[PDB]
Amino acid sequence: MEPQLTKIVDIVENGQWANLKAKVIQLWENTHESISQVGLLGDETGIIKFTIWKNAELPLLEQGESYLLRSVVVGEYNDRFQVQVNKNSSIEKLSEPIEVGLEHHHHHH
């Protein structure tokens, strides 16, 4: 039984429980105790900002690396939507990078 996959553009609902896979386009180490880490998630359907709470006790993510987020909840940030990770949540590294980068291709890199 695989988990329910939800797309960023399919959010249109805060406080929703689902599972999403994305890469960290940018990371920011937080020094405040309330917030542990915050960055951006690069999904093939778009991008979204997420924040990890210290009460989650989760390891730091690697920039440019793909990450799988299971059992997460959507938070309502002012006018924009954001994904908040807390306890019960899990994170697994994927050896299959996601596009998030396709617009030009001359000959070969």
Automatic annotation (TrEMBL):
Signal peptide: none annotated. It comes from the Archaea. This is Conserved protein. It comes from Methanosarcina mazei (strain ATCC BAA-159 / DSM 3647 / Goe1 / Go1 / JCM 11833 / OCM 88) (Methanosarcina frisia).
